[PDB]
């Protein structure tokens, strides 16, 4: 598994070199913003259930076919599987966010996922949408939390978004 430092190290090694002063300071900056990062990961963990629930309510509000017989979130067994997948993806997105690298998300979650869903008959476009809704709400929470020191978290909100967007793209 990689994190943002480990990634630097692998690229340096492929040159046969000690880390460039370029790469050093990029990593010094990651340490600089790490308290904000911890709050951002904490924002997701602290509202995981609601993020999934709210995404869910809204997914089925839009796509009332999934909860009809014939639909891929019917009966209870399938809805529980769908709720479970929402959690799994939100979980690996939070891991990537602590790590500063998408690899854990791509390697343990996204790799093969689309082909799984197609084999199953699970509508990937609906799954992509559920991921887009989790993103909206998750970032909502990253941006408006309990008595965190005021500052600018937009860099981290972007990065979180790209992890949500990776997952969506990979699946649709």
């Amino acid at each position: 598994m990689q994190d943002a430092f480990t990634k630097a190290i692998v690229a340096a090694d492929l040159r046969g070199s000690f880390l460039s002063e370029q790469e050093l300071n990029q990593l010094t900056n990651l340490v600089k913003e790490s308290n904000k990062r911890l709050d951002a990961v904490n924002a997701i963990t602290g509202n995981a259930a609601e993020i999934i629930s709210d995404a869910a309510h809204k997914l089925f509000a839009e796509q009332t076919d999934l909860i009809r017989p014939g639909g891929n979130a019917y009966p209870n067994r399938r809805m529980a599987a769908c709720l479970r997948d929402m959690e799994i993806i939100l979980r690996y997105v939070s891991y990537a966010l602590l790590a500063g690298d998408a690899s854990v998300l791509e390697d343990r979650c996204l790799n093969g996922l689309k082909e799984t869903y197609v084999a199953l008959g699970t509508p990937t476009r609906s799954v992509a949408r559920a991921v887009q809704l989790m993103k909206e709400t998750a970032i909502g929470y990253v941006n408006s939390p309990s008595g965190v020191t005021r500052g600018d978290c937009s860099a981290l909100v972007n990065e979180a978004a790209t992890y949500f967007d990776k997952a969506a793209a990979s699946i649709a």
Partner: protein
């Protein structure tokens, strides 16, 4: 889908033997029992409409506050999705009655029930009370072994929710 026939066939397959007497004897039970089961099924089927409206209302009468604004028994969509859900239960009860086992209930309502209800803030108590009411009224639509069958499956749902 868990049923008498299916279960015995599965047993045979696992054992890799042959449909012997034990199995045949067991299967006869399911066949002999079909008449009572299917009478319960027909009665529950044609009364479905009212059994559902009766139980839906009883959920509001037992939990009055549900029907106030800001609550989950308010507005057309909640009350619509409720009727539907009780209708799902009665539907699978009739299926379990016709099938000769709990399979339809196990596969389509029990597997996953709590996770779903917990994510969506649905209290089992409502559903138990819907079913307790349905059980009260089915006392006078059926009797004898058809009633016992209807009861078996209604109670199975109540225990499943608990």
């Amino acid at each position: 889908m868990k049923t008498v026939i299916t279960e015995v066939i599965a047993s045979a397959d696992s054992q890799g033997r042959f449909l012997n007497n034990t199995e045949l004897q067991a299967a006869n039970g399911r066949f002999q029992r079909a008449t009572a089961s299917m009478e319960a099924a027909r009665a529950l089927t044609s009364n479905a409409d009212s059994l559902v409206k009766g139980a839906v209302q009883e959920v509001y009468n037992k939990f009055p506050y549900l029907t106030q604004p800001g609550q989950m028994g308010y507005g057309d969509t909640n009350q619509a999705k409720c009727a539907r859900d009780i209708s799902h239960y009665l539907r699978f009860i009739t299926y379990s009655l016709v099938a000769g086992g709990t399979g339809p209930l196990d596969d389509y309502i029990v597997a996953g029930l709590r996770e779903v209800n917990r994510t969506f803030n649905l209290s089992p108590s409502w559903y138990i009370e819907a079913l307790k009411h349905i059980k009260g009224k089915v006392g006078s639509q059926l009797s004898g072994q058809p009633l016992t069958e209807a009861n078996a499956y209604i109670d199975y749902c109540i225990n499943a929710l608990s």
